[PDB]
Symmetry: C3
Subunit: 340 residues, 3 copies
Amino acid sequence: AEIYNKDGNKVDLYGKAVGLHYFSKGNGENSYGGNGDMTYARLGFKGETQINSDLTGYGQWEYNFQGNNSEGADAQTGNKTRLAFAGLKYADVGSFDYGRNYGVVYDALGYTDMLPEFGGDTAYSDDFFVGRVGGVATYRNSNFFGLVDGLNFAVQYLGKNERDTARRSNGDGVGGSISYEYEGFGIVGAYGAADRTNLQEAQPLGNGKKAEQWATGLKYDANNIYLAANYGETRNATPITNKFTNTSGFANKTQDVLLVAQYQFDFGLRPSIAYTKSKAKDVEGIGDVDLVNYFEVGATYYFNKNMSTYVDYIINQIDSDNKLGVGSDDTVAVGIVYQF
Amino acid sequence: AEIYNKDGNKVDLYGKAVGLHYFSKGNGENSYGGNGDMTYARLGFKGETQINSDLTGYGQWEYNFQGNNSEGADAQTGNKTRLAFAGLKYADVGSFDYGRNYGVVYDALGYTDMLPEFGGDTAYSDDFFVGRVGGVATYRNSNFFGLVDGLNFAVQYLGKNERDTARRSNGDGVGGSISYEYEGFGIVGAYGAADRTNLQEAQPLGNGKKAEQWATGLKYDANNIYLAANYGETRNATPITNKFTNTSGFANKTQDVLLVAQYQFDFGLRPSIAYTKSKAKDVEGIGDVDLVNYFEVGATYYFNKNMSTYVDYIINQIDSDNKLGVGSDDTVAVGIVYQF
Amino acid sequence: AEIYNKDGNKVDLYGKAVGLHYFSKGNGENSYGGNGDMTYARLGFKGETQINSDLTGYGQWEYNFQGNNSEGADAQTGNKTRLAFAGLKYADVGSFDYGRNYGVVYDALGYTDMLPEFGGDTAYSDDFFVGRVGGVATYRNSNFFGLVDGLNFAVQYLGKNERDTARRSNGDGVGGSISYEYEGFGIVGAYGAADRTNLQEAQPLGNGKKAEQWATGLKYDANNIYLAANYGETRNATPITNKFTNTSGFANKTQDVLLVAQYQFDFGLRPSIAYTKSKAKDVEGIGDVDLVNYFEVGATYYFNKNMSTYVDYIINQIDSDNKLGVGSDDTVAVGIVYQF
């Protein structure tokens, strides 16, 4: 909701309150999504100022407040800043911003990241180029300088981030994306590679000095119809855990397939059908193991642009024999979301 | 302060800056409320959208930022999300919301929760039904479906919350409240019971598999006069600590009495008189021990609807011989509050 | 940006998104400011209500969200409440507020606290009177009761804060400031003394029972010209660390000199020249050691009141022979800031 707009500068203060609950058998420790209260809220602001006819300055910040914690010691569990950056758009030259933003390879994965609750399984956070990462400089260009309609590209530099964890770290890397959209249709290609930190190489799982992520997307968006499919692979980038030996690291190689089919009825119902399978290859010792595998049936009902509720149901195609210990149970999510 | 209102959707962004200080002798470790800076701030939003003539969608989030911490390691001590839920009101059918919200039994305790600073002693957080808890589904009904004026009831389901602490945990339980208000007068009854988690039963203090909380309230509200009294009891629900043996758990049985008398002068002074006594029964070993006991004299002065200051003074009726080690000293609170 | 203004009460919701990066050689552990992503955001609110013709109530809260953390365990590193207080202004009597606010001695140091990124080195947080501290009652007076133009003073009481750290603690103390400004010119004097806590005296570095901080400032502000100089000293107040023996405490005595020269060009460039030197005296064992010493060359470019970027470059005058281990390398900062 735009709360301010004077002197060529408008500030949009958005957010939302999401009452959420997960339903799975047992404690939910062996299920796909877990079990129990998952309530949370959002807050943030999109700022945009017109420096002049061609020049636009902008900034954004988005935080995540968990609502399923107590007010005691664990009050903080789950809270974090999701986005935080600032930049400039210029005429038909393109735009540039820096801070914590999405990785270029998400330009592709975004296509199937549409499910009511789950989905977008291969878009991990702080995982190089496939999700939200810190310290990325992103240049983007629309309509190839205004010369070609529907043709966009983007180049991105990922600063070295040597954190405490192997999972949340990353060396220096570059990446890019070319996407063309023409009348309901869109095709996207994204790729990126980066140095792995010492702590990352020192891990038992995963072998190499270089991380790679590429994904291509194809979608038809129009007429209340949303059809999208994603295919991508990774080298020493997807984080995995062997729950049996308590080993941590990265999967030498992964192949990812996301499929989504949704329809928006006029009275406000939007049923969703999705399939996701992410298999890892050459997992030292295990060999080939499925990390994610399921069919998704769900629907979101929009009372309007502010209110809505949804049921998201994951039919877990992982079996109890999973070599890494990936949960094999189903998970149903029920949500009731207000937002401004 | 309502910062937005367009298209049947209004967003209220509220909050406040409370400069606060506690005065007690010694460290304040043996006093009622402690001693030293207690400054803090609030932020939150009430969102409400009219889906149509009968249907209203709403959401809310409320956070607590402590201001008495340094900017070092302890920056986070005390911060937490207080509220976070979303729901729907429908015609004369009633309303329903889910998330972190107040427990039904607070419908009663709310009556005496009026003091300038302290009071509301038996409305603990994350304590089943008597305070703010996570993962509660609440159905409420006004004027018995619009058929009877001033007659409201509410049923509430409390989801299982197995946290790290015994104090902040809780099993599954149901609860409700019937309140009738007729012309300055109000009578309320609330009750709820829930399963105790294993960690809770594994505690040294408290014995049982079931937790119970009920409280009834009676109030006269009108003519600048506020008179209210609450009486309630609990089974294995009120959290207690034996400061001597460092034992923790719950009081098998408690009896609670809250009394409040306030008057609102026209020039903006509102003197407050209150009495609170909460005694525990059958405390394994100790027997009968007072958890809370004091007389309260205080006054809030409202410069207007945005500004105000207050002095709250607790005359602690607990003696130095308390078997559990409950502080026995007095505490005076001085506050200066801005809010929007 | 003022988002609300009705009934004599206006609420200003401000904030900013700062994409930031530090450039220094090596792991940035031996440099002046460090090395790597330094992105962060701000949020806060200034509230002001007119109780009447002479009376104004106000409140403020300002938080700091770091953007260079991951969304994992370290999500919280760096976040904190910077400001949180409320108060009243009255006619020509003066103003009074309480909470977490700036220390009086900052009234002086503020003069040179102007650099694009760094600078203001001797204005530490939670360090008695020279920076933001918790539990301070501040009385301020403008134009000596409206009797003398440009003559302001302020008296401040600092409540005892016995935290976990020696660095973040402080006993009871008083302080004040007299500043006179007449047509482009300003002269300021500030002083304060406070009791040191036991934990503070129990430290290896620093000796005494009393902490003292005084600083005087002289500035010319007008005509796009900003010239300012600060000189101050301290007794057992400036926190120092011996990186060799891993000793912590306070410098018995320090002498501080800040010099800043800036010019605001009309097209939006503001070049900045600054010199800072803070030397400690009588450091048990070491003797005289420089804590801070550098020349600063930088410039901020303002696209307008909302957008801007800057390069801040510190030419570190500390040498590799520093007896305390103070970083000796240079640091360049590049920033792109949106704000509302």
